[PDB]
């Protein structure tokens, strides 16, 4: 019954709105302007960066950065903190996916460990366009060029996210679509180390039917959107793998820089 | 129309049968199961290999294990010969895909270039089970044990493919399904360097529709098989990536000597 699938879709969309403070709808409203209400301050260089810590709250350094925790590192610990923040929002969302909390506690942990970053990059795309990305709840906007100009290793951390975002965003998905998609990502029975794969795949199948109908009803004219979206899951895994190896490089070139315990746990070069 | 999709399906199945000697239906009869007659020669040890090699249809080298070209190298090289063969079979199959030959020639070469490894492992799964893989047109069977026991570098070469095959084969696809799936892989759109993505994605759209109808008619009891199959591409990709990686490492094993050229030419890297 497609009626039961529509309810699941509404339920997941509802939980999504309740778990994620900055939706795609809000992100696009901020980026596309035509607004005086919430135009973001723009960071495209060191100076605007300094200024940025004025109209927008930023627990980081404004002045000199070199001999005082450089800008690259400052921006990096910022992403770090924001990522853990996202893991907590995604975890809250996960618990709302029917069946998720009734699974083996060990597998709940495994599903989150492997799904969190894939979800992070999917949602990160909502806050990006070809020119940059929204920051601090949408009050700021850091330029893609400014980011690609950071010190040797940090200079290329974000580029692959942008490359993915521009392609992914061309699919023109809205929050109700993404809510089902993120749920699908989490319930992957092919995650390494899962104990009970069957209960996980039973839920994903239900989620997949939900996503399929949702895309057919919401995008009547977009041929094979469902399949096209599912293939994007390959680009996500790649982004993760690529990010991981870059993180191993960072770890060795910056022995004075620290990683958040949560993020470190999830990570295992995995 | 459902008619254009069935025709496309039937057309691909026919060309697939004509292009690939060993069909999965053919290989499954041999593997797990009997169909008692002409049982494959089993390579499970060094002695069984030496014997099988000198008694199998392997046009290349003979058994010589004594400070002269180790077994692992001869096995590895052997898989290279068969891979070059398959590439030509994949190439002929590609040309039968409606619209393929009509694409920009550089684009045709690009699609084949980046799609042959994904296709090779996909079809390899057809000849594998959890304990081994069919060899020499199915006249042989090299056990998973003997393979994982090879030298340090070569022992971890095929294992990852066995793991993928185990999961992939659980989908229980047959040649009619695989025929369309392989064509979808070939007509990707995200291969690097493509010049005209539109016609490529347009054909894949048509192929995906065909694959979807085929799975629903051929496996009416398998819910969301279409979606599950597409997500298996995330695995194939990692496999390929991980594979070119070990490959580079192998290069850092065997190298020198003015003997073997022209042969090294015929292979390169694929
Ligand atoms: C439901 C989840 C919503 C996810 C929203 C993510 C916003 N974000 C963080 C993106 C990110 C960047 C870098 C990351 O690297 C770390 C922290 C490295 C340990 C990781 O977790 O792998 C991880 C995640 C982010 N936003 C921005 C804006 C500008 C510059 C950098 C930046 O990073």
Curated annotation (Swiss-Prot), chains A, B:
GO biological process, one term: negative regulation of cholesterol storage
Cross-link Glycyl lysine isopeptide (Lys-Gly) (interchain with G-Cter in ubiquitin) residue location(s): 18
NR LBD domain sequence ranges: 4-269
UniProt motif (9aaTAD) ranges: 261-269
Top-rank taxon, per record: Eukaryota
Chain positions recorded as rosiglitazone binding sites: 80-83, 117, 243, 267
Expressed in which tissues: Highest expression in adipose tissue. Lower in skeletal muscle, spleen, heart and liver. Also detectable in placenta, lung and ovary.
Annotated spans, Interaction with FAM120B: 1-46
Induction context: (Microbial infection) Expression increases when incubated with M.tuberculosis or its lipoprotein LpqH; induction is TLR2-dependent (at protein level).
GO cellular component: chromatin; cytosol; intracellular membrane-bounded organelle; nucleoplasm; nucleus; receptor complex; RNA polymerase II transcription regulator complex
Keywords per UniProt: Activator, Biological rhythms, Cytoplasm, Diabetes mellitus, Disease variant, DNA-binding, Glycoprotein, Isopeptide bond, Metal-binding, Nucleus, Obesity, Phosphoprotein, Receptor, Transcription, Transcription regulation, Ubl conjugation, Zinc, Zinc-finger
Subcellular location: Nucleus; Cytoplasm
GO molecular function terms noted in the UniProt entry: alpha-actinin binding; arachidonate binding; chromatin binding; DNA binding; DNA binding domain binding; DNA-binding transcription activator activity, RNA polymerase II-specific; DNA-binding transcription factor activity; DNA-binding transcription factor activity, RNA polymerase II-specific
Entry keyword Isomerase: no
Record comment: activity regulation: PDPK1 activates its transcriptional activity independently of its kinase activity.
PTM summary: Phosphorylated in basal conditions and dephosphorylated when treated with the ligand. May be dephosphorylated by PPP5C.
UniProt subunit comment: Interacts with FOXO1 (acetylated form). Heterodimer with other nuclear receptors, such as RXRA. The heterodimer with the retinoic acid receptor RXRA is called adipocyte-specific transcription factor ARF6. Interacts with NCOA6 coactivator, leading to a strong increase in transcription of target genes. Interacts with coactivator PPARBP, leading to a mild increase in transcription of target genes. Interacts with NOCA7 in a ligand-inducible manner. Interacts with NCOA1 and NCOA2 LXXLL motifs. Interacts with ASXL1, ASXL2, DNTTIP2, FAM120B, MAP2K1/MEK1, NR0B2, PDPK1, PRDM16, PRMT2 and TGFB1I1.
Family: Belongs to the nuclear hormone receptor family. NR1 subfamily.
Disease with which this protein is associated in UniProt: Defects in PPARG can lead to type 2 insulin-resistant diabetes and hyptertension. PPARG mutations may be associated with colon cancer. Obesity: A condition characterized by an increase of body weight beyond the limitation of skeletal and physical requirements, as the result of excessive accumulation of body fat.
Domains (record comment): The 9aaTAD motif is a transactivation domain present in a large number of yeast and animal transcription factors.
Functional summary from the UniProt entry: Nuclear receptor that binds peroxisome proliferators such as hypolipidemic drugs and fatty acids. Once activated by a ligand, the nuclear receptor binds to DNA specific PPAR response elements (PPRE) and modulates the transcription of its target genes, such as acyl-CoA oxidase. It therefore controls the peroxisomal beta-oxidation pathway of fatty acids. Key regulator of adipocyte differentiation and glucose homeostasis. ARF6 acts as a key regulator of the tissue-specific adipocyte P2 (aP2) enhancer. (Microbial infection) Upon treatment with M.tuberculosis or its lipoprotein LpqH, phosphorylation of MAPK p38 and IL-6 production are modulated, probably via this protein.
Name listed for the protein in its UniProt record: Peroxisome proliferator-activated receptor gamma
Organism of this sequence: Homo sapiens
Lineage: Eukaryota, Metazoa, Chordata, Craniata, Vertebrata
């Amino acid at each position: 019954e497609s009626a039961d699938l529509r309810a699941l879709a509404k339920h997941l969309y509802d939980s999504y709105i309740k778990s994620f403070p900055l939706t795609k709808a809000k992100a696009r409203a901020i980026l596309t302007g035509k607004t005086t209400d919430k135009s973001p301050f723009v960071i495209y260089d060191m100076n605007s960066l300094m200024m940025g810590e004025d109209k927008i709250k930023f627990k980081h350094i404004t002045p000199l950065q070199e001999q005082s925790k450089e800008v690259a590192i400052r921006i990096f610990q910022g992403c770090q903190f924001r990522s853990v923040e996202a893991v907590q929002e995604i975890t809250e969302y996960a618990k709302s996916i029917p069946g998720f909390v009734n699974l083996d506690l060990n597998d709940q942990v495994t599903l989150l460990k492997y799904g969190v970053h894939e979800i992070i990059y999917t949602m990160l795309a909502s806050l990006m366009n070809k020119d940059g990305v929204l920051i601090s709840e949408g009050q700021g906007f850091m330029t893609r060029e400014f980011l690609k100009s950071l010190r040797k290793p940090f200079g290329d951390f974000m580029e692959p996210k942008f490359e993915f975002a521009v392609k992914f965003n061309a699919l023109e998905l809205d929050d109700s679509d993404l809510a089902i998609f993120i749920a699908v990502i989490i319930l992957s029975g092919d995650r390494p180390g899962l104990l009970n794969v069957k209960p996980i795949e039973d839920i994903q199948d239900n989620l997949l039917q939900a996503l399929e109908l949702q895309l057919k009803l919401n995008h009547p004219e977009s041929s094979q959107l469902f399949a096209k979206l599912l293939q994007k899951m390959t680009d996500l895994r790649q982004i993760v793998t690529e990010h991981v190896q870059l993180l191993q490089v960072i770890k060795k070139t910056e022995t004075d820089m620290s990683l958040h315990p949560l993020l470190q746990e999830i990570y295992k070069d995995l």
